[PDB]
Amino acid sequence: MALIERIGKALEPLMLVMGLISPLATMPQLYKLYVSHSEHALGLSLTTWLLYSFIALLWTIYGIYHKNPTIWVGNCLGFLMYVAMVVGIIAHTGGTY
Amino acid sequence: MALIERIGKALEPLMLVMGLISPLATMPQLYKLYVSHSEHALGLSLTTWLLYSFIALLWTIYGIYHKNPTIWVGNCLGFLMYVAMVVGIIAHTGGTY
Ligand SMILES: CCCCCCCC/C=C/CCCCCCCC(=O)OC[C@H](O)CO
Ligand SMILES: CCCCCCCC/C=C/CCCCCCCC(=O)OC[C@H](O)CO
Ligand SMILES: CCCCCCCC/C=C/CCCCCCCC(=O)OC[C@H](O)CO
Ligand SMILES: CCCCCCCC/C=C/CCCCCCCC(=O)OC[C@H](O)CO
Ligand SMILES: CCCCCCCC/C=C/CCCCCCCC(=O)OC[C@H](O)CO
Ligand SMILES: CCCCCCCC/C=C/CCCCCCCC(=O)OC[C@H](O)CO
Ligand SMILES: CCCCCCCCCCCCCCC
Ligand SMILES: CCCCCCCCCCCCCCC
């Protein structure tokens, strides 16, 4: 399986950066929630973003404990992004699932 | 830092399960997109879920390559969940960012 190996090996020095992509990718979602499409906030699941926040927090603690920035750097940024999603969903819906 | 250590150590045997939580947590978000609140799909960022899908796919390939189910199992389920988000956003908006 040359392709799987090629990609797998190529990702090795990029793993810390990889952890930053999804948190950074959440910025357009935050933009829609807070700025451009707040009237559609009810379409967002509070449950989903709460659990994202929870898991990101756990990985952050894990990574900090083991002095592994590849883990905690991306997940710390993630945690903040997903908490911002939680706050915004509550702010524009008054509460939902 | 006893608390950080306590949590960090406790998570060690749970890391595979941890990888399943966010994908499973996406189910209420998929429910809102497809079933209960499709009229608010424009509030979802296609860019965000596309990039989630992309990163999940990369981790899946990485985990498969290194025979590490703690990595690829959760990210494979994630990949499918986030692709489902992508498809649904396109289906109910006709395209957006
Ligand atoms: C605590 C964390 C909070 C901080 C993170 C929240 C970031 C919110 C904005 C991200 C910009 C990404 C989307 C780009 C928005 C560009 C705005 C603009 O240029 O105008 C609208 C544009 O035309 C669109 O169609
Ligand atoms: C007072 C603000 C201090 C922020 C430091 C928090 C530290 C924890 C990080 C959470 C990131 C997201 C924080 C939430 C961003 C606030 C957005 C907000 O509440 O806006 C509501 C809306 O504008 C009205 O309807
Ligand atoms: C364990 C990881 C998860 C941690 C999660 C951290 C966020 C906790 C919630 C903060 C809500 C603050 C939002 C304030 C919204 C402004 C007030 C408003 O507009 O109405 C909302 C009203 O309070 C309807 O309950
Ligand atoms: C390819 C991946 C696609 C498959 C994954 C997509 C899952 C979509 C539904 C998840 C259920 C979670 C939300 C629970 C919905 C319960 C429905 C119900 O009981 O009624 C509505 C309820 O009252 C609500 O308020
Ligand atoms: C024909 C279906 C076969 C599915 C196998 C795909 C394999 C890849 C996994 C992607 C998971 C999400 C797949 C997307 C689920 C389809 C939902 C859909 O298209 O619904 C549109 C809407 O109902 C109309 O407006
Ligand atoms: C690299 C990881 C990312 C991979 C991402 C995989 C998904 C690719 C998009 C499939 C769209 C299919 C959706 C079909 C929607 C039904 C038709 C419709 O309702 O209008 C949409 C129309 O095509 C407006 O473009
Ligand atoms: C493994 C997590 C699956 C999440 C499915 C639960 C959806 C129903 C909502 C109840 C939980 C809401 C409280 C926020 C955690
Ligand atoms: C590191 C990723 C940041 C994402 C910010 C880009 C938002 C603007 C939309 C352009 C990209 C849309 C194409 C889908 C990948």
CSV table of C-alpha atoms and ligand atoms in Angstrom, one decimal:
chain,number,residue,atom,x,y,z
A,1,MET,CA,0.0,0.0,0.0
A,2,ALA,CA,2.4,2.7,-1.3
A,3,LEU,CA,-0.2,5.6,-1.1
A,4,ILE,CA,-1.1,5.0,2.5
A,5,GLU,CA,2.6,4.7,3.4
A,6,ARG,CA,3.5,7.8,1.4
A,7,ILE,CA,0.8,9.9,3.1
A,8,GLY,CA,1.5,8.4,6.6
A,9,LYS,CA,5.2,9.2,6.4
A,10,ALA,CA,4.6,12.7,5.0
A,11,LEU,CA,2.3,13.6,7.9
A,12,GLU,CA,4.9,12.8,10.6
A,13,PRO,CA,6.6,16.2,10.8
A,14,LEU,CA,3.3,17.9,10.3
A,15,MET,CA,1.3,16.5,13.3
A,16,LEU,CA,1.4,19.6,15.4
A,17,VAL,CA,0.2,21.7,12.5
A,18,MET,CA,-2.5,19.1,11.8
A,19,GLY,CA,-3.8,19.7,15.3
A,20,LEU,CA,-4.3,23.4,14.5
A,21,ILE,CA,-6.3,23.0,11.3
A,22,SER,CA,-9.7,22.0,12.7
A,23,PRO,CA,-9.6,24.7,15.4
A,24,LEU,CA,-8.7,27.3,12.8
A,25,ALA,CA,-11.2,25.8,10.4
A,26,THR,CA,-13.9,26.5,13.0
A,27,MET,CA,-13.4,30.3,12.5
A,28,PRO,CA,-15.8,30.5,9.5
A,29,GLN,CA,-18.4,28.5,11.6
A,30,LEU,CA,-17.9,31.1,14.4
A,31,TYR,CA,-18.3,33.9,11.9
A,32,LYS,CA,-21.6,32.5,10.7
A,33,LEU,CA,-22.8,32.0,14.3
A,34,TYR,CA,-21.9,35.4,15.6
A,35,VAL,CA,-21.8,37.7,12.5
A,36,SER,CA,-23.4,36.7,9.2
A,37,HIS,CA,-26.1,34.1,10.1
A,38,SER,CA,-27.0,34.3,13.8
A,39,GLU,CA,-30.6,33.9,12.8
A,40,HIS,CA,-29.8,30.3,11.9
A,41,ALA,CA,-28.1,29.5,15.2
A,42,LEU,CA,-30.9,27.0,16.1
A,43,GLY,CA,-29.5,24.8,13.4
A,44,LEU,CA,-26.5,24.2,15.5
A,45,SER,CA,-26.4,21.5,18.2
A,46,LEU,CA,-25.4,22.8,21.6
A,47,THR,CA,-24.8,19.1,22.6
A,48,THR,CA,-22.3,18.6,19.8
A,49,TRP,CA,-20.2,21.7,20.6
A,50,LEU,CA,-20.3,21.1,24.4
A,51,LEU,CA,-18.9,17.6,23.9
A,52,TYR,CA,-16.3,18.9,21.4
A,53,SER,CA,-15.2,21.4,24.1
A,54,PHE,CA,-15.1,18.6,26.7
A,55,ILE,CA,-12.9,16.3,24.6
A,56,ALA,CA,-10.6,19.1,23.5
A,57,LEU,CA,-10.1,20.0,27.2
A,58,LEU,CA,-9.3,16.4,28.1
A,59,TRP,CA,-6.7,16.1,25.3
A,60,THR,CA,-5.3,19.5,26.4
A,61,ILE,CA,-4.8,18.3,29.9
A,62,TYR,CA,-3.3,15.0,28.7
A,63,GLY,CA,-0.9,16.8,26.4
A,64,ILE,CA,0.2,19.3,29.0
A,65,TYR,CA,0.8,16.5,31.5
A,66,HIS,CA,3.0,14.6,29.1
A,67,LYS,CA,4.7,17.8,27.8
A,68,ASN,CA,3.5,17.0,24.3
A,69,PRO,CA,2.7,20.2,22.4
A,70,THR,CA,1.7,18.2,19.3
A,71,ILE,CA,-1.3,17.2,21.4
A,72,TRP,CA,-2.1,20.1,23.7
A,73,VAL,CA,-1.4,23.1,21.4
A,74,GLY,CA,-4.0,22.3,18.8
A,75,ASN,CA,-6.5,21.0,21.4
A,76,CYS,CA,-6.1,24.1,23.6
A,77,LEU,CA,-6.9,26.3,20.6
A,78,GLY,CA,-9.7,23.9,19.8
A,79,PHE,CA,-11.1,24.0,23.3
A,80,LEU,CA,-11.4,27.8,23.1
A,81,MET,CA,-13.0,27.7,19.6
A,82,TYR,CA,-15.6,25.1,20.7
A,83,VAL,CA,-16.4,27.0,23.9
A,84,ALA,CA,-17.0,30.1,21.8
A,85,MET,CA,-19.4,28.0,19.8
A,86,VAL,CA,-21.2,26.9,23.0
A,87,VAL,CA,-21.5,30.5,24.3
A,88,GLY,CA,-22.7,31.8,20.9
A,89,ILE,CA,-25.4,29.1,20.5
A,90,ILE,CA,-26.7,29.9,24.0
A,91,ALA,CA,-26.6,33.6,23.3
A,92,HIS,CA,-28.6,33.4,20.1
A,93,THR,CA,-31.1,30.6,21.0
A,94,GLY,CA,-31.6,31.0,24.7
A,95,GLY,CA,-30.8,27.3,25.0
A,96,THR,CA,-31.2,24.2,22.7
A,97,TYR,CA,-29.9,20.7,22.2
B,1,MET,CA,0.0,19.6,39.7
B,2,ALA,CA,-2.0,16.6,41.2
B,3,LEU,CA,-5.2,17.3,39.3
B,4,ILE,CA,-3.6,17.4,35.8
B,5,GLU,CA,-1.7,14.2,36.6
B,6,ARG,CA,-4.7,12.5,38.0
B,7,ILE,CA,-6.8,13.2,34.8
B,8,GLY,CA,-3.8,12.6,32.5
B,9,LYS,CA,-3.2,9.1,33.9
B,10,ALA,CA,-6.9,8.3,34.0
B,11,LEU,CA,-7.3,9.0,30.3
B,12,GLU,CA,-4.6,6.6,29.3
B,13,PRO,CA,-6.7,3.4,28.9
B,14,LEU,CA,-9.6,5.5,27.5
B,15,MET,CA,-7.8,7.1,24.5
B,16,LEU,CA,-9.5,4.9,21.9
B,17,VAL,CA,-13.0,5.6,23.4
B,18,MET,CA,-12.1,9.3,23.5
B,19,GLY,CA,-11.6,9.3,19.8
B,20,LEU,CA,-15.2,8.1,19.4
B,21,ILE,CA,-16.8,10.8,21.5
B,22,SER,CA,-16.7,13.8,19.1
B,23,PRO,CA,-17.8,11.7,16.1
B,24,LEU,CA,-20.7,10.3,18.1
B,25,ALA,CA,-21.3,13.8,19.5
B,26,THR,CA,-21.9,15.0,15.9
B,27,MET,CA,-25.1,12.9,15.6
B,28,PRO,CA,-27.3,15.6,17.2
B,29,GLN,CA,-25.8,18.1,14.8
B,30,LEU,CA,-26.5,15.8,11.9
B,31,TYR,CA,-30.1,15.4,13.2
B,32,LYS,CA,-30.6,19.2,13.2
B,33,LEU,CA,-29.1,19.5,9.7
B,34,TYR,CA,-31.2,16.7,8.1
B,35,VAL,CA,-34.3,16.3,10.2
B,36,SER,CA,-35.3,18.9,12.7
B,37,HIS,CA,-33.8,22.2,11.5
B,38,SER,CA,-32.8,22.0,7.9
B,39,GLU,CA,-34.2,25.5,7.3
B,40,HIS,CA,-31.2,26.7,9.4
B,41,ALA,CA,-28.5,24.9,7.4
B,42,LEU,CA,-27.2,28.2,6.0
B,43,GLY,CA,-25.9,28.8,9.6
B,44,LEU,CA,-23.4,26.0,9.1
B,45,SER,CA,-20.0,26.6,7.5
B,46,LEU,CA,-19.3,24.2,4.6
B,47,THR,CA,-15.6,25.3,4.9
B,48,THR,CA,-15.5,24.1,8.5
B,49,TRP,CA,-16.9,20.7,7.9
B,50,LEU,CA,-14.9,20.1,4.7
B,51,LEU,CA,-11.7,20.8,6.6
B,52,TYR,CA,-12.9,18.5,9.5
B,53,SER,CA,-13.4,15.8,7.0
B,54,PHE,CA,-10.0,16.4,5.4
B,55,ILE,CA,-8.1,16.2,8.7
B,56,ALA,CA,-10.1,13.2,9.9
B,57,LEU,CA,-9.2,11.4,6.7
B,58,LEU,CA,-5.5,12.2,7.1
B,59,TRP,CA,-5.5,10.9,10.7
B,60,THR,CA,-7.4,7.8,9.6
B,61,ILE,CA,-4.7,7.1,6.9
B,62,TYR,CA,-2.0,7.8,9.5
B,63,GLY,CA,-3.5,5.4,12.0
B,64,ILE,CA,-4.2,2.7,9.5
B,65,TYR,CA,-0.6,2.9,8.3
B,66,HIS,CA,0.8,2.6,11.8
B,67,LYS,CA,-1.7,-0.1,12.9
B,68,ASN,CA,-2.9,2.2,15.6
B,69,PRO,CA,-6.7,1.8,16.2
B,70,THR,CA,-6.6,4.4,19.0
B,71,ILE,CA,-6.0,6.9,16.1
B,72,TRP,CA,-7.8,5.5,13.1
B,73,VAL,CA,-11.0,4.0,14.6
B,74,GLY,CA,-12.3,7.3,16.0
B,75,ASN,CA,-11.1,9.4,13.0
B,76,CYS,CA,-12.7,7.0,10.5
B,77,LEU,CA,-16.0,7.3,12.2
B,78,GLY,CA,-15.4,11.1,12.4
B,79,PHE,CA,-14.5,11.3,8.7
B,80,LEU,CA,-17.9,9.7,7.8
B,81,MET,CA,-19.8,12.0,10.2
B,82,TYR,CA,-18.1,15.1,8.8
B,83,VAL,CA,-18.6,14.1,5.2
B,84,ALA,CA,-22.3,13.6,6.1
B,85,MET,CA,-22.3,17.2,7.3
B,86,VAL,CA,-20.7,18.4,4.1
B,87,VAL,CA,-23.3,16.5,1.9
B,88,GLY,CA,-26.2,17.8,4.0
B,89,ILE,CA,-25.0,21.4,4.0
B,90,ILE,CA,-24.8,21.3,0.2
B,91,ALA,CA,-28.1,19.6,-0.1
B,92,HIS,CA,-30.0,22.2,1.9
B,93,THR,CA,-28.2,25.3,0.8
B,94,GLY,CA,-27.1,24.6,-2.7
B,95,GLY,CA,-23.7,25.7,-1.7
B,96,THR,CA,-22.2,28.1,0.8
B,97,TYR,CA,-19.0,28.9,2.7
C,1,LIG,C1,-12.5,32.9,21.2
C,1,LIG,C2,-12.5,32.6,19.7
C,1,LIG,C3,-13.2,33.6,18.9
C,1,LIG,C4,-12.3,34.2,17.8
C,1,LIG,C5,-12.5,33.4,16.5
C,1,LIG,C6,-13.7,33.8,15.8
C,1,LIG,C7,-13.5,34.1,14.3
C,1,LIG,C8,-14.7,34.7,13.6
C,1,LIG,C9,-14.4,35.2,12.3
C,1,LIG,C10,-13.5,34.3,11.5
C,1,LIG,C11,-13.3,34.8,10.1
C,1,LIG,C12,-13.4,33.6,9.0
C,1,LIG,C13,-14.5,34.0,8.0
C,1,LIG,C14,-14.1,35.1,7.1
C,1,LIG,C15,-15.0,36.3,7.3
C,1,LIG,C16,-14.7,37.4,6.3
C,1,LIG,C17,-15.5,38.7,6.6
C,1,LIG,C18,-15.6,39.5,5.3
C,1,LIG,O1,-14.6,39.7,4.6
C,1,LIG,O2,-16.9,39.8,4.8
C,1,LIG,C19,-17.8,38.7,4.6
C,1,LIG,C20,-17.3,37.8,3.5
C,1,LIG,O3,-17.7,38.4,2.3
C,1,LIG,C21,-17.9,36.5,3.6
C,1,LIG,O4,-18.8,36.2,2.5
C,2,LIG,C1,-15.9,39.0,28.5
C,2,LIG,C2,-15.3,38.2,27.4
C,2,LIG,C3,-14.0,37.5,27.9
C,2,LIG,C4,-13.6,36.2,27.1
C,2,LIG,C5,-12.6,35.4,27.8
C,2,LIG,C6,-13.2,34.0,28.0
C,2,LIG,C7,-12.1,33.0,28.4
C,2,LIG,C8,-12.4,31.6,28.0
C,2,LIG,C9,-12.3,31.4,26.5
C,2,LIG,C10,-13.7,31.3,25.8
C,2,LIG,C11,-13.7,31.8,24.4
C,2,LIG,C12,-15.0,32.3,23.9
C,2,LIG,C13,-15.5,33.4,24.9
C,2,LIG,C14,-16.9,33.9,24.4
C,2,LIG,C15,-16.8,35.1,23.6
C,2,LIG,C16,-17.9,36.1,23.9
C,2,LIG,C17,-19.0,36.2,22.8
C,2,LIG,C18,-20.3,36.7,23.3
C,2,LIG,O1,-20.6,36.4,24.5
C,2,LIG,O2,-21.2,37.4,22.5
C,2,LIG,C19,-22.5,37.2,22.8
C,2,LIG,C20,-23.4,38.0,21.8
C,2,LIG,O3,-22.5,38.9,21.2
C,2,LIG,C21,-24.5,38.7,22.5
C,2,LIG,O4,-25.7,38.2,22.1
C,3,LIG,C1,-16.5,21.1,30.1
C,3,LIG,C2,-16.4,22.0,28.8
C,3,LIG,C3,-17.6,22.8,28.5
C,3,LIG,C4,-17.5,24.2,29.1
C,3,LIG,C5,-18.5,25.1,28.5
C,3,LIG,C6,-18.2,26.6,28.9
C,3,LIG,C7,-19.4,27.5,28.5
C,3,LIG,C8,-20.5,27.4,29.6
C,3,LIG,C9,-21.7,28.2,29.2
C,3,LIG,C10,-21.5,29.7,29.2
C,3,LIG,C11,-22.8,30.4,28.8
C,3,LIG,C12,-22.6,31.9,28.8
C,3,LIG,C13,-23.4,32.5,27.6
C,3,LIG,C14,-24.0,33.9,27.9
C,3,LIG,C15,-25.0,34.3,26.8
C,3,LIG,C16,-25.5,35.7,27.0
C,3,LIG,C17,-26.9,35.8,27.6
C,3,LIG,C18,-28.0,35.5,26.6
C,3,LIG,O1,-28.0,36.1,25.6
C,3,LIG,O2,-28.9,34.6,27.0
C,3,LIG,C19,-28.4,33.3,27.4
C,3,LIG,C20,-29.2,32.9,28.6
C,3,LIG,O3,-28.3,32.8,29.7
C,3,LIG,C21,-29.8,31.5,28.3
C,3,LIG,O4,-29.4,30.6,29.3
C,4,LIG,C1,-23.3,8.7,7.7
C,4,LIG,C2,-23.7,9.2,9.1
C,4,LIG,C3,-25.1,9.4,9.3
C,4,LIG,C4,-25.7,8.7,10.5
C,4,LIG,C5,-25.7,9.6,11.7
C,4,LIG,C6,-26.7,10.6,11.7
C,4,LIG,C7,-27.5,10.6,13.0
C,4,LIG,C8,-28.7,11.5,13.0
C,4,LIG,C9,-29.6,11.3,14.2
C,4,LIG,C10,-28.9,11.3,15.4
C,4,LIG,C11,-29.7,11.2,16.7
C,4,LIG,C12,-29.3,12.2,17.8
C,4,LIG,C13,-30.4,13.1,18.1
C,4,LIG,C14,-31.6,12.5,18.8
C,4,LIG,C15,-32.8,12.6,18.0
C,4,LIG,C16,-34.0,12.0,18.6
C,4,LIG,C17,-35.3,12.1,17.8
C,4,LIG,C18,-36.5,12.1,18.6
C,4,LIG,O1,-36.6,11.3,19.6
C,4,LIG,O2,-37.5,13.1,18.5
C,4,LIG,C19,-36.9,14.4,18.5
C,4,LIG,C20,-36.5,14.8,19.9
C,4,LIG,O3,-37.6,15.1,20.7
C,4,LIG,C21,-35.5,15.9,19.9
C,4,LIG,O4,-36.1,17.0,20.6
C,5,LIG,C1,-26.6,6.7,-1.7
C,5,LIG,C2,-26.1,6.8,-0.2
C,5,LIG,C3,-24.9,6.0,0.0
C,5,LIG,C4,-24.1,6.5,1.2
C,5,LIG,C5,-22.7,5.9,1.2
C,5,LIG,C6,-21.6,7.0,1.2
C,5,LIG,C7,-20.3,6.4,1.6
C,5,LIG,C8,-19.4,7.5,2.2
C,5,LIG,C9,-19.8,7.9,3.5
C,5,LIG,C10,-20.5,9.3,3.6
C,5,LIG,C11,-21.5,9.4,4.7
C,5,LIG,C12,-22.6,10.4,4.4
C,5,LIG,C13,-23.3,10.0,3.1
C,5,LIG,C14,-24.4,11.0,2.8
C,5,LIG,C15,-25.8,10.6,3.3
C,5,LIG,C16,-26.8,11.0,2.3
C,5,LIG,C17,-27.8,12.0,2.8
C,5,LIG,C18,-28.4,12.8,1.7
C,5,LIG,O1,-27.9,12.9,0.6
C,5,LIG,O2,-29.7,13.4,1.9
C,5,LIG,C19,-29.9,14.6,1.1
C,5,LIG,C20,-31.2,15.1,1.4
C,5,LIG,O3,-32.0,14.1,2.1
C,5,LIG,C21,-31.9,15.5,0.1
C,5,LIG,O4,-32.1,16.9,0.2
C,6,LIG,C1,-11.3,15.4,1.2
C,6,LIG,C2,-12.4,15.2,2.2
C,6,LIG,C3,-13.7,16.0,1.8
C,6,LIG,C4,-14.6,15.1,0.9
C,6,LIG,C5,-16.0,15.6,0.8
C,6,LIG,C6,-16.9,14.6,0.2
C,6,LIG,C7,-18.2,15.2,-0.2
C,6,LIG,C8,-18.1,15.9,-1.5
C,6,LIG,C9,-19.4,16.6,-1.9
C,6,LIG,C10,-20.6,15.7,-2.2
C,6,LIG,C11,-21.8,16.5,-2.5
C,6,LIG,C12,-23.0,15.7,-2.8
C,6,LIG,C13,-24.3,16.3,-2.3
C,6,LIG,C14,-25.5,16.1,-3.2
C,6,LIG,C15,-26.6,17.0,-2.8
C,6,LIG,C16,-27.9,16.7,-3.4
C,6,LIG,C17,-28.3,17.6,-4.6
C,6,LIG,C18,-28.8,18.9,-4.1
C,6,LIG,O1,-29.8,18.9,-3.3
C,6,LIG,O2,-28.3,20.1,-4.5
C,6,LIG,C19,-26.9,20.2,-4.4
C,6,LIG,C20,-26.3,20.7,-5.7
C,6,LIG,O3,-25.4,19.8,-6.2
C,6,LIG,C21,-25.5,22.0,-5.3
C,6,LIG,O4,-24.2,21.8,-5.8
C,7,LIG,C1,-21.4,10.0,23.0
C,7,LIG,C2,-22.2,11.3,23.0
C,7,LIG,C3,-23.4,11.1,22.2
C,7,LIG,C4,-24.3,12.3,22.3
C,7,LIG,C5,-25.8,12.0,22.0
C,7,LIG,C6,-26.7,12.7,23.0
C,7,LIG,C7,-27.7,13.6,22.3
C,7,LIG,C8,-28.9,14.0,23.2
C,7,LIG,C9,-28.7,15.2,24.1
C,7,LIG,C10,-28.4,14.8,25.5
C,7,LIG,C11,-27.1,15.4,26.0
C,7,LIG,C12,-27.1,16.9,26.1
C,7,LIG,C13,-26.2,17.4,27.2
C,7,LIG,C14,-24.9,18.0,26.7
C,7,LIG,C15,-23.7,17.1,26.9
C,8,LIG,C1,-6.6,26.7,8.3
C,8,LIG,C2,-8.0,26.8,7.7
C,8,LIG,C3,-8.6,28.1,7.9
C,8,LIG,C4,-9.9,28.3,7.1
C,8,LIG,C5,-10.3,29.7,6.8
C,8,LIG,C6,-10.8,29.9,5.4
C,8,LIG,C7,-12.2,30.5,5.3
C,8,LIG,C8,-12.6,31.1,4.0
C,8,LIG,C9,-13.1,30.0,3.0
C,8,LIG,C10,-12.2,29.6,2.0
C,8,LIG,C11,-11.9,28.1,1.9
C,8,LIG,C12,-13.2,27.4,1.5
C,8,LIG,C13,-12.8,26.1,0.7
C,8,LIG,C14,-13.1,24.9,1.6
C,8,LIG,C15,-11.8,24.2,2.1
